[PDB]
Design an enzyme around this catalytic site. Structure first.
Site, PDB file in Angstrom:
ATOM      1  CG  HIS A 185      -0.536   0.116   2.547  1.00  0.00           C
ATOM      2  ND1 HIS A 185      -0.099   1.321   3.061  1.00  0.00           N
ATOM      3  CD2 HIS A 185      -0.469  -0.772   3.571  1.00  0.00           C
ATOM      4  CE1 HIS A 185       0.262   1.157   4.323  1.00  0.00           C
ATOM      5  NE2 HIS A 185       0.029  -0.099   4.662  1.00  0.00           N
ATOM      6  N   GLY A 219       2.738   8.406  15.358  1.00  0.00           N
ATOM      7  CA  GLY A 219       3.108   8.206  13.970  1.00  0.00           C
ATOM      8  C   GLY A 219       3.940   6.971  13.686  1.00  0.00           C
ATOM      9  CB  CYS A 238       7.278   4.316  10.010  1.00  0.00           C
ATOM     10  SG  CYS A 238       8.185   4.708  11.553  1.00  0.00           S
TER      11      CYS A 238
END
EC number: 3.4.19.12
Lengths: 296, 299
Positions: free
Chosen positions: B40, B142, B144
């Site tokens: 994605h 956040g 990753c």
């Protein structure tokens, strides 16, 4: 506060070596051209009742110490003592030496432990220095020791070296200048840790974490005072709270709109009554091994 | 079984890189001369509801992909999709490639997770694959991505790669051949995990650990049948026990003197009474993230 994370251990893995004197093998820390390890490694089973480290060490010579870095042997070219840690000078400097410093932490602070079993680094876990100056560690199958550290950017801060298991499953050790944490001695003798208490300011920081993550069911309309709160705390075996703790939590209160004494009122009512079946942050326990800085 | 320990992460840290495509940057795994990462990464924010991965990928060329191994830029010389993972061929093999293999795990098995935050490895933790095929990981500040592994002797078994946070707090992902664990897809559509149940066989192995370390207060004089145990366990959202689980615990019941179905009877009473205030192996909760294999190593 989802899950207790440890720092990645790679920078530390390449500093671990095995150190043998006699029958005793345990873990040492290899930085520049020096290997650090607990001084009790020169002892034999009989020396450990009441040793004179001065005496036994002058009768030791460089070739009494076998240092293995993997399959590479390191030749010891000197030795000295610094409090409770022995410093072995070796022929070669460690090419994997990270940027590092030695620091001493305070109770309530957190760090990661790289634990030795069966002669190699085999486990990593996150923990906190308890108020009674012990670490609730894993000691199953004994151990070959351990090192505690934090990572601040590229710099590794070494803050703990293991020396002994206590009659309880907990551990005691020194900083890397060989000063013990807590009222312990590196002899074979009866020693028991003082009473453990829950680290209040960390519990508060963890509830702040839940509120940020949307878990808000424990808030109420009330406040309390430091003095009223602290008298309730001592009853439940929780550390007192000081104005410093309140200050340190101030960012979480300004970010969230919940005053600290307002959240202490929430914690106050959680002691007396309990969670029932609701959980905070997916946990049905009050976590005290997350620091304010950790929640960030 | 006092502390949930993770494997030392160093052999995996030397394999984490950063794959960028358009505005998206996430973690990839660099082994030999291939980089593996969630497909994605080629998705625009608009494309996340109904992405046509084959349409999106045919329109990319090699220099659309920006791979950074710390400070060095790696050069992409080809790419292919393999289920839900992108494979990016680069022109330099990773000199830090460990002995490794790709294994698919089953629910109840444990592994360590190296979590990427702000473009680099920043945390490590130990977990189990839940019976609903999700991970209770940690998602915040956040992420990753992350990569799951076990280390045996000196060989790294890679078993998991993170793809998405589900609307619950749990995370879902694939093995390293790109097949999802569980019934999830890599689109931002309504997906919900089935009920999370307790991993009965791990609790029992833990209990055996506690008897071995001398905690015995929860034991009783009763025994039970497998079918009677499973009837009661289900009312507390405990997974059913199979005969395979019984055999697997055999080693522990031999070492310890307590038959498996004896220990089940004690687990039945614990579920009915609660722990009062007592603790087992220092824990005030029943722990289901240590396997029998983990337990037989330490004991």
């Amino acid at each position: 506060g989802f899950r207790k994370m440890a720092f990645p251990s790679g920078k530390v893995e390449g500093c671990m070596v095995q150190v043998t004197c006699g029958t005793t093998t345990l873990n040492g820390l290899w930085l520049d051209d020096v290997v650090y390890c607990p001084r009790h490694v020169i002892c034999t089973s009989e020396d450990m009742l009441n040793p004179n480290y001065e005496d036994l060490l002058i009768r030791k010579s460089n070739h009494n110490f076998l240092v293995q870095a993997g399959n590479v042997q390191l030749r010891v070219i000197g030795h000295s003592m610094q409090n409770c840690v022995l410093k072995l000078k070796v022929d070669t400097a460690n090419p994997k030496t990270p940027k590092y410093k030695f620091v001493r932490i305070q109770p309530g602070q957190t760090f990661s432990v790289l634990a030795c079993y069966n002669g190699s680094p085999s486990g990593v876990y996150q923990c906190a220095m308890r108020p009674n100056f012990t670490i609730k560690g894993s000691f199953l199958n004994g151990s070959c020791g351990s090192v505690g550290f934090n990572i601040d950017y590229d710099c590794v801060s070494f803050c703990y070296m293991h020396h002994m298991e206590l009659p309880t499953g907990v551990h005691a050790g020194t900083d890397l200048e060989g000063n013990f944490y807590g009222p312990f001695v590196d002899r074979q003798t009866a020693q028991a840790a003082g009473t453990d208490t829950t680290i209040t300011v960390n519990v508060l920081a963890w509830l702040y974490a839940a509120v940020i993550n949307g878990d808000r069911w424990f808030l109420n309309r009330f406040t309390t005072t430091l003095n009223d709160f602290n008298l309730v705390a001592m009853k439940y075996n929780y550390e007192p709270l000081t104005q410093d703790h309140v200050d340190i939590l101030g960012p979480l209160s300004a970010q969230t709109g919940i005053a600290v004494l307002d959240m202490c009122a929430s914690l106050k009512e959680l002691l007396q009554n309990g969670m029932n079946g609701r959980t905070i942050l997916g946990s049905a326990l009050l976590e005290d091994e997350f620091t304010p800085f950790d929640v960030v």
